[PDB]
Write a protein that binds this ligand. Structure first.
Ligand SMILES: NC(=O)c1c(F)ccc(OCc2nc(-c3ccc(C(F)(F)F)cc3)c(Br)o2)c1F
Ligand SMILES: Nc1nc2c(ncn2[C@@H]2O[C@H](COP(=O)(O)OP(=O)(O)O)[C@@H](O)[C@H]2O)c(=O)[nH]1
Ligand SMILES: [Ca+2]
Length: 305
């Protein structure tokens, strides 16, 4: 049974983790990593690592990614110890600050050294934060890409595409944080449940090990044309930087009730295939959940660009 850990690094990453702790994911271990002792003290994470006590005296890294990097390197043994035994690690962080930008790639590097399939989920700053913030964040993203197995990048500007003029900022932030939450829940489902056409953690590693940026999504529909609608929703991910176009690897699962038809499954798979590379390494799964009535749920991860 694969062990999952979710690690928040710096403010934005810990914000994401705090929402997940609030909802509950009993089988998943949450780890909070920060330079900022005040923020870390308020976290309800079961496992906390204050990095850079010597460097920052319990303050943040003040927008200097070199300080975040050095803080993580200084606490390497603590980070190793907290990760040890994980089969899969998610590292969540907002790029552009001091702590996440610098520390998150070190954490991801350690995770992979400890043997974990390592997935980064990171944001790029809003354009309103300025070119400097954006340039620091880009360096972070590239460092993350080099350290992880697979990277999911959410430009914060994409949040401006999903709000109306009154949508509360915290509600917009919840939508961005749901990318991580739904990714973790979906992998938990994959590991826990034996499928009629079973996918397991070795299939996840095949598609996700030593890749780069990825598209992930989930689509739910019912009624007429449900399979096509669910597939299209799964592959259209308005918050992610990466599109499915040209994908060389896909992991795809369809979950339906007892009415799930072979014809529908083909329709959904063809939607996903059509979008990917013609030599796509596609691994397809199915689970029948008799508790469902007319809903279909299509889950996709696409890698290799
Ligand atoms: N067919 C199965 O054995 C199966 C099951 F029984 C339940 C769920 C399930 O798939 C859920 C699923 N989860 C993923 C997935 C893929 C990637 C990630 C990521 F990127 F790590 F976030 C998270 C989740 C995918 Br593609 O599909 C199955 F494949
Ligand atoms: N979407 C989202 N972005 C955030 C959040 N908090 C911070 N950010 C973004 O993450 C960047 C770095 O902030 P933060 O993680 O607090 O800095 P650090 O603690 O110094 O790593 C900011 O420049 C924002 O673009 C959040 O809760 N949600
Ligand atoms: Ca399974």
């Amino acid at each position: 049974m694969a062990t999952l850990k979710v690690i928040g690094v710096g403010g934005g990453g810990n914000n994401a983790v705090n929402r997940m702790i609030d909802h509950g994911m009993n089988n998943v271990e949450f780890i909070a990593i920060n330079t900022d002792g005040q923020a870390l003290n308020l976290s309800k994470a079961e496992s906390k690592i204050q990095i850079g006590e010597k460097l920052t005296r319990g303050l943040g890294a003040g927008a200097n990614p070199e300080i975040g990097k050095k803080a993580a390197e200084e606490s390497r043994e603590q980070i190793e110890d907290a990760i040890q035994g994980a089969d899969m690690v998610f590292v969540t962080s907002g790029m552009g600050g001091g702590t996440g930008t610098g520390a998150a790639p070190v954490v991801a590097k350690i995770a992979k050294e400890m043997g974990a399939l390592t997935v980064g989920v990171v944001t790029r700053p809003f354009s309103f934060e300025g070119r400097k913030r954006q340039t620091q964040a880009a360096a972070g993203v590239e460092a993350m890409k080099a350290a992880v197995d697979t990277l999911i990048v959410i430009p914060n500007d994409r949040l401006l595409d999903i709000v109306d003029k009154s949508t509360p900022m915290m509600e917009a932030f919840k939508e961005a944080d749901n990318v991580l939450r739904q990714g973790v829940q979906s992998i938990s489902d994959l590991i826990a449940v034996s499928g009629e056409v079973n996918l397991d953690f070795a299939d996840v590693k095949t598609i996700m090990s030593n890749q780069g940026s990825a598209l992930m999504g989930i689509g739910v529909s019912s009624g007429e044309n449900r399979a096509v609608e669910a597939a299209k929703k799964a592959i259209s991910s308005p918050l992610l930087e990466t599109s499915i176009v040209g994908a060389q690897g896909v992991l795809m699962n369809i979950t339906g009730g007892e009415s799930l038809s072979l014809f529908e499954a083909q329709e959904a798979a063809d939607i996903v295939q059509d979008a990917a590379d013609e030599d796509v390494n596609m691994i397809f799964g199915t689970v029948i959940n008799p508790e469902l009535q007319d809903e279909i749920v299509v889950t996709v991860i696409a890698t290799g660009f």
